[PDB]
Amino acid sequence: MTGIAEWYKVYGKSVAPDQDARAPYYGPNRPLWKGPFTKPKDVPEYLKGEYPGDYGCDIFKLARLPANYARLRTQELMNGRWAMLGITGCLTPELINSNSTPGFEPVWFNTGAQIFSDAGIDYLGVPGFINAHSLFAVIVVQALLMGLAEYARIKFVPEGADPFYPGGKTFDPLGFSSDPEILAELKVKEIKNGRLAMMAMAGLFAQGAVTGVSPLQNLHDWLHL
Amino acid sequence: SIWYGADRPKYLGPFSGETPSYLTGEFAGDYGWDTAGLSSDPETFARNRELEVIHARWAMLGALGCLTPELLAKSGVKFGEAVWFKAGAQIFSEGGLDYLGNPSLVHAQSILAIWASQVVLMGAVEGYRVAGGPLGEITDPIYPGGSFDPLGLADDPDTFAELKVKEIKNGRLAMFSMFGFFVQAIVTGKGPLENLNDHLADPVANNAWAYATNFVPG
Amino acid sequence: YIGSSTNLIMVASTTLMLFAGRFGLAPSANRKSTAGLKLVDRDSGLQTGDPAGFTATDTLACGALGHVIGVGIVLGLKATA
Amino acid sequence: DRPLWFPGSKAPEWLDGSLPGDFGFDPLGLGSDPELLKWFVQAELVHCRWAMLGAAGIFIPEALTKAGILNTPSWNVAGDQQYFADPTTLFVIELILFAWAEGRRWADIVNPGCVNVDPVFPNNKLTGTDVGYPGGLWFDPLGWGQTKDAKKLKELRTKEIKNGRLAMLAVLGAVVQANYTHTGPIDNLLAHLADPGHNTIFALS
Amino acid sequence: FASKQSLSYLDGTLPGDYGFDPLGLMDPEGAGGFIDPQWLPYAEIINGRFAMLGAAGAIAPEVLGRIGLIPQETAIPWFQSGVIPPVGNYSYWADPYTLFVLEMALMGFAEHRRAQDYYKPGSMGKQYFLGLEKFLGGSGNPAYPGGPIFNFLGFGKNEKELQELKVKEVKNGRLAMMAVLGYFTQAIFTGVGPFQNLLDHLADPVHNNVLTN
Numbered sequence A: 001m002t003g004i005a006e007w008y009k010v011y012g013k014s015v016a017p018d019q020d021a022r023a024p025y026y027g028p029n030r031p032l033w034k035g036p037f038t039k040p041k042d043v044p045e046y047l048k049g050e051y052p053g054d055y056g057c058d059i060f061k062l063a064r065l066p067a068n069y070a071r072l073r074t075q076e077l078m079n080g081r082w083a084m085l086g087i088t089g090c091l092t093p094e095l096i097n098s099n100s101t102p103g104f105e106p107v108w109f110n111t112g113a114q115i116f117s118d119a120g121i122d123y124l125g126v127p128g129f130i131n132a133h134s135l136f137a138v139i140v141v142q143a144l145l146m147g148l149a150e151y152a153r154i155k156f157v158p159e160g161a162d163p164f165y166p167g168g169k170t171f172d173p174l175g176f177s178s179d180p181e182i183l184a185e186l187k188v189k190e191i192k193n194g195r196l197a198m199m200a201m202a203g204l205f206a207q208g209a210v211t212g213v214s215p216l217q218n219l220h221d222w223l224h225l
Numbered sequence B: 001s002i003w004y005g006a007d008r009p010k011y012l013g014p015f016s017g018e019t020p021s022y023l024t025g026e027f028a029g030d031y032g033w034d035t036a037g038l039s040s041d042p043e044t045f046a047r048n049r050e051l052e053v054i055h056a057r058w059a060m061l062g063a064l065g066c067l068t069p070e071l072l073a074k075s076g077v078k079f080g081e082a083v084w085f086k087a088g089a090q091i092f093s094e095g096g097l098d099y100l101g102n103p104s105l106v107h108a109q110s111i112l113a114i115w116a117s118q119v120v121l122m123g124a125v126e127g128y129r130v131a132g133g134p135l136g137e138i139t140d141p142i143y144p145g146g147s148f149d150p151l152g153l154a155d156d157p158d159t160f161a162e163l164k165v166k167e168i169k170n171g172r173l174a175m176f177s178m179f180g181f182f183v184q185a186i187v188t189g190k191g192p193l194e195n196l197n198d199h200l201a202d203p204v205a206n207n208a209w210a211y212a213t214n215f216v217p218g
Numbered sequence C: 001y002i003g004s005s006t007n008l009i010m011v012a013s014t015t016l017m018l019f020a021g022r023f024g025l026a027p028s029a030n031r032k033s034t035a036g037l038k039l040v041d042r043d044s045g046l047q048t049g050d051p052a053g054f055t056a057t058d059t060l061a062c063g064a065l066g067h068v069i070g071v072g073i074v075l076g077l078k079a080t081a
Numbered sequence D: 001d002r003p004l005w006f007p008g009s010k011a012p013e014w015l016d017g018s019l020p021g022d023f024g025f026d027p028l029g030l031g032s033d034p035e036l037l038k039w040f041v042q043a044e045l046v047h048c049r050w051a052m053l054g055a056a057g058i059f060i061p062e063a064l065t066k067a068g069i070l071n072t073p074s075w076n077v078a079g080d081q082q083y084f085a086d087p088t089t090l091f092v093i094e095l096i097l098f099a100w101a102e103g104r105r106w107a108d109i110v111n112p113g114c115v116n117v118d119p120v121f122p123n124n125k126l127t128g129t130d131v132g133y134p135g136g137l138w139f140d141p142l143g144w145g146q147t148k149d150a151k152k153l154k155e156l157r158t159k160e161i162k163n164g165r166l167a168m169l170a171v172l173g174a175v176v177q178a179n180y181t182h183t184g185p186i187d188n189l190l191a192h193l194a195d196p197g198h199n200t201i202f203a204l205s
Numbered sequence E: 001f002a003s004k005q006s007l008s009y010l011d012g013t014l015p016g017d018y019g020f021d022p023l024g025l026m027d028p029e030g031a032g033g034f035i036d037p038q039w040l041p042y043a044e045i046i047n048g049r050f051a052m053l054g055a056a057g058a059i060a061p062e063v064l065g066r067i068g069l070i071p072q073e074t075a076i077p078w079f080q081s082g083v084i085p086p087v088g089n090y091s092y093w094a095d096p097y098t099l100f101v102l103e104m105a106l107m108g109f110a111e112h113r114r115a116q117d118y119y120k121p122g123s124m125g126k127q128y129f130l131g132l133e134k135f136l137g138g139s140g141n142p143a144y145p146g147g148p149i150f151n152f153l154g155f156g157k158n159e160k161e162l163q164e165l166k167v168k169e170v171k172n173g174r175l176a177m178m179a180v181l182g183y184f185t186q187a188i189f190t191g192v193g194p195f196q197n198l199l200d201h202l203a204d205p206v207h208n209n210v211l212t213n
C-alpha cells in the first residue's frame, strides 16, 4: 500500500470516495452499447458484466462459451497494448520534427524505406545514433529478441499470477495494484484507452492510404487555420 | 540475500580468507575489505559510510555529466565546447555558455553570478541535508526516503536492501571511473572518448605505455 | 496566432495554475492555507463531480489567476526581449 | 486413427474426424466453437468449388492456346476485351440471376430443407439430406452422391475437397505469379522445366 | 576437480564429466522452465557435433587445394562460399537462395523428426509413413539413439568402451568449439582464412600479435 496508493485513491480515482469504483463499470448498471435505447434483448444473457469494458455488444454469435470469451479478452488486451505503443510511436517523431532530415524520415509509413537509403536510419537525425544500413540484421535481432520475450511470456509464467496481469515486483514497481477495487477501475481505464488507440491505428492506416500524413489532414486540411 | 549473510562473496572472490571481525554484513556492498583498518571505531565507521555513499552519488552524477556532452558532440550535436575538463572555459568565451549550443537556452555570460547562485543554493541544500528542511526531516543521515522516494520503490525492506546493494555497486564503479577520468585527462590530454577511440584501433601501442616516457626527469 | 509565443505562454500559465489547483499544490475552496502556508483542509457546502474536490469556483479562480500571470509574463517578455 | 498434418501431435479436440478430410490442422484455434465449424465448412466448400472452376478456366484455355488449337487471350486481360454487351450490364444481370441462388443457399444453411420444393410445380424436388448437398435431377444429373457409404461416399468427398484446396492454391499462385512476372503461367512452367534453379523468385528480383 | 572447486551438483557420473562449472547453471534455484536436466547435455553435444563438421569444413577446401587433389576453383575462402554475401560470393549452378531453401526444407524434415523423437520416444517407430517406421527405431536415450541404419558398423560393444568413446567425443567437441570460435576471431580481425593463418605462423613465427591495427 505504497505512497502512490491513497494518492490515486484521492486524485486519480474516477468516482467519488464515498462511492466504490465497481457499480458504474460492472453489474447491471453498465452504459450498454446502444445508450438509452439498448432494450433488454440486445444485451446477451451471458454478457452479464463482471469483466472490464463490456457493453453487451455481441451482434454475431461469437463468445457464448467461457473459453472463447476469455481468449478473446486476452487477444483484445494484447492488440490494445500494442496499439497504444504503436499510435504513440507513430505520432512522436512527426511531432518532434516534421522536416525531412535525410536520416530521419518522420513520416510513419515511409520510415521502412529509409533503411535502404544511403543515409540510413539516424535516430533524431543524429549522425552517430545507430546509423543502421542492413535490413537482415534488423530481421535477425527482431526474431531473436521477440522469440525470447514471447517464449518467456507463454512458458516462464510464475504459475501463481495471471498470464496477462502478472503484477508482482517487476511489472508493478509503483504498486498500483494494492487495492482490488482500484485495480478493476484501472483495468477498465486500460481497456478503454487501448480500444481508443486501436481505432486510432485503424484510422491512421486508412487516412495514410487515402491522404498523405498525420499532421497534414489535421493542420493542412479539415482544420483550415 | 547472499550479500547480507555471514557468507558473502568478498572482494577476493571464492578464495577470500580473513574477514574483519566487525564486518558481519548488515550493510550494502560489504566485501570484507578493510586492509587499512580505518573504520575500527563504530562512529568512524558510520562517518566513513556516509562519506562513501555521498561520494558514490556525486561520482555517478559526475560520470554521467562528463560522458554525455562528449558523446553528443561525437555523435553530431553542436556545442561551444565538449571536453569535460575544457567546458568551464565557455564562460570566458565571446559566444558565452549556451545549453546545447542554443542561444535561447541559459545563455549565461558571467562567472560571478553562477558562482554566487551555486554557493547560495548548495549551502541551503547541504544545510537541509544536515538538519532537515522543506522536503522532510532527518531520520537516517544517508537514506531519508519520503519526498526523495516519491514513487515508493523501496517500500519492501528486502527490496530496499537489494536496491541499496545495487546503488552502492553502481556508485563505486562510477567513482573508479571518475578517478580514471582524472588521471587520463592529466596524462594523455584528451577526453575519455578520444582515449577509447585510440584503444579501438591498434590497441598494442594505444595504452599508458605510449605516454610512460613523458614524465621522465630531464 | 495559435502557434504563437503569446498563445503558448497564456495556455501554459492557465494550465499550470489549474494543475496546481486541482492537485494540492495551491490554495483552493476546500483547502485553506494557514499563517505558515500549510494547506489545511476546509469543508465548504459546494457539491462537485470532481472526486478530488475541485469545484467550479476553483476553476474560475485558477483560470483568472492564470490569465493574470500569463498577461504579466507576456508583457514583461515583450518589453525586455 | 487418421493421418495428421503434424505427426506425433494431438489433434484439436473439436475435430473428431467425422467431417470429410479432417487433418486436424487448426494451429490458430479458429474452430473452437462447434457452431462455427458448419459455417466454415460451407464457406470452404463454396470457395473450393469456385476455385476448381477458376483453375480450369485459367489453365485449360491457356494450355490449349499454347498448343495452338485455341486462341484464348491471356486471362489477365480478359476483362479488358471488347464484348457485344456492356460488362457492367453483364455484372448486374449475373447479380440478379445469382440472387435467387444465394437466397436459396442462405435459407437452406439457416434452415435445411426449407427451399427444397420447386415453386412453380411443387412436384419437382431434390433428394438431398445433408446440408449443402441437394442431389436431385438438376444438381445431380448422374445420380452420384446418394449411396450407402461404408467406404463409398467419404473417399469421394475427401478427394473432392483435396482437389478443391489444390485448385485454391493454384489460382492464388496464378494471380500472384502474374503480378510478379508479367507473363502467363505457361511461360513460368517452361522456365522451370528448362532450368529450375536459374528461374525462380529471386531470378526476377 | 576441475581447477575451481565443485559443489556436488555433478559427481562425474554423466558421460564426459569434468566439473568445470564455476557458476553452476543447473543450480535448482538458478534452473527452471527452459532449463531441463536432459536438455543441456543434449544441446552441448549437438553444438559440439556440428562444431566437428564446421571446423573440418572451414579448412577442408583449403587443405585439399594445398595437397593438390581438388579443383582450384574450390580454393575460395570459407566466408566467401555464400555464408556472408557482402564479403564475397562463390560460383554455383543455382542461386544461393535456392540452395538455401532446399537445405532449410530438408533440415526442417530431419530436425522435425528428431525433435518428435526427443519429445515422444515412439516417433518414426510407430508413426505413419511409407515403411520407414520400422527403419527408424527409437533405441536407448534420444541423444544417443542408434538404430537399424545408425548401427550399421556395430561399434561400441562394451559399456566401458561406450563411456571412453563418449568422453572422447565431448572433449573433441569442446576443442572443436574453441577452434571454431578462433576461426571467427581470426576472420573478423585479419580478414583471411584460418589455413592462411597456419601458413603464417609456420612461415613467420613472430608475424603478428592480435592484429596491430
Ligand SMILES: CC(/C=C/C=C(C)/C=C/[C@@]12O[C@]1(C)C[C@@H](O)CC2(C)C)=C\C=C\C=C(C)\C=C\C=C(C)\C=C\[C@@]12O[C@]1(C)C[C@@H](O)CC2(C)C
Pocket: D025, D026, D027, D028, D029, D030, D031, D047, D050, D051, D052, D053, D054, D055, D057, D058, D075, D076, D078, D079, D167, D168, D169, D171, D172
Ligand atoms: C487459397 C484460398 C484460401 C486459403 C486459405 C488458407 C490457406 C487457410 C488456412 C487455414 O484456415 C485453415 C484452413 C484452418 C485454420 O485453422 C488455419 C489456417 C492456416 C488459417 C482461396 C481461394 C479461392 C479461389 C477462388 C475462389 C478462385 C476464383 C477464380 C476466379 C475469380 C476466376 C476469374 C476469371 O473469370 C474471371 C473473373 C474473368 C477472367 O479474369 C478469367 C478468370 C481469371 C478465369
Ligand SMILES: CC(/C=C/C=C(C)/C=C/[C@@]12O[C@]1(C)C[C@@H](O)CC2(C)C)=C\C=C\C=C(C)\C=C\C=C(C)\C=C\[C@@]12O[C@]1(C)C[C@@H](O)CC2(C)C
Pocket: E020, E021, E022, E023, E024, E025, E047, E048, E050, E051, E053, E054, E055, E056, E057, E058, E078, E079, E081, E083, E176, E177, E178, E180, E181
Ligand atoms: C557449433 C559451432 C560451429 C559450427 C560451424 C559450422 C556448422 C560451420 C559451417 C560453415 O563454416 C563452414 C564449415 C564453411 C562454410 O560452409 C560456411 C559455413 C556453412 C558457415 C561452434 C560452437 C561453439 C561453442 C562455444 C564457443 C561455446 C562456449 C562456451 C563457454 C565458453 C562456456 C563457458 C561456461 O559454461 C561453462 C563451461 C561453465 C559455466 O559455469 C561458466 C561459463 C563461463 C558460462
Ligand SMILES: CC1=C[C@H](O)CC(C)(C)[C@H]1/C=C/C(C)=C/C=C/C(C)=C/C=C/C=C(C)/C=C/C=C(C)/C=C/C1=C(C)C[C@H](O)CC1(C)C
Pocket: A057, A058, A059, A060, A062, A079, A080, A082, A083, A085, A086, A087, A088, A089, A090, A107, A108, A109, A111, A198, A199, A201, A202
Ligand atoms: C466490438 C465488436 C463486437 C461485435 O462482434 C461487432 C464487431 C464489429 C465484430 C466487433 C468490433 C471489432 C473491432 C472494431 C475491431 C478493431 C480492431 C482494430 C482496429 C485493431 C487494431 C490494431 C492496431 C495495432 C495492433 C497497431 C500496432 C502498431 C504498431 C506496432 C506500430 C509500429 C510502428 C511505429 C510505432 C512507428 C513506425 O514508424 C512504423 C511502425 C513500425 C509500423
Ligand SMILES: CC1=C(/C=C/C(C)=C/C=C/C(C)=C/C=C/C=C(C)/C=C/C=C(C)/C=C/C2=C(C)CCCC2(C)C)C(C)(C)CCC1
Pocket: C014, C059, C060, C061, C063, C064, C067, C068, C071
Ligand atoms: C468538463 C471536463 C473537464 C474539463 C475540461 C476543461 C477544458 C476545463 C477547462 C476550464 C478552463 C480552461 C477554464 C478557464 C477559465 C478562465 C478564466 C475564468 C479566465 C478569466 C480571465 C480573466 C478574469 C482576465 C481578466 C483581465 C485581466 C486580469 C487582465 C486584463 C484584462 C482583463 C480585465 C480581461 C474535465 C477534465 C474535468 C473532465 C472532462 C470534461
